[PDB]
Amino acid sequence: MDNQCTVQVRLELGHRAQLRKKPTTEGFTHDWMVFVRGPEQCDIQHFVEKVVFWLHDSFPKPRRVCKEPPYKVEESGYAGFIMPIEVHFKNKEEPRKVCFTYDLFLNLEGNPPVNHLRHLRCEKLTFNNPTTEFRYKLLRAGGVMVMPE
């Protein structure tokens, strides 16, 4: 257990949806934005090389890549879908990336009370035995070292 070390960093994933005042000519009823961001006062660009959002195949160019912040996709649509999201790290050792499956919903299952929706998903990422450089990238992004796993 001489050089065991575990680093935990937090990512915030989320989306906002609004019913349009007029549906588009294609019949899009909603404007949405999906994002990956750091917690308050945390720059995840230190450890994040790129984020890839995999949109539904109805959307044009469905593989959306943001190599720089802001890590977000903004589009208009008529239905919610499962959007795979890849967060690629600034490292040369595994884990190179983490893949999330995000539920972009235009309304919450139970009721449609208002025209505006906000959802937030905090995800804590755990790295065991990080290399020196990636640890410092992680620590600079607000990460902390915890009990070694």
Partner: peptide
């Protein structure tokens, strides 16, 4: 709401 619709889903696809």
């Amino acid at each position: 709401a619709a889903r696809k």
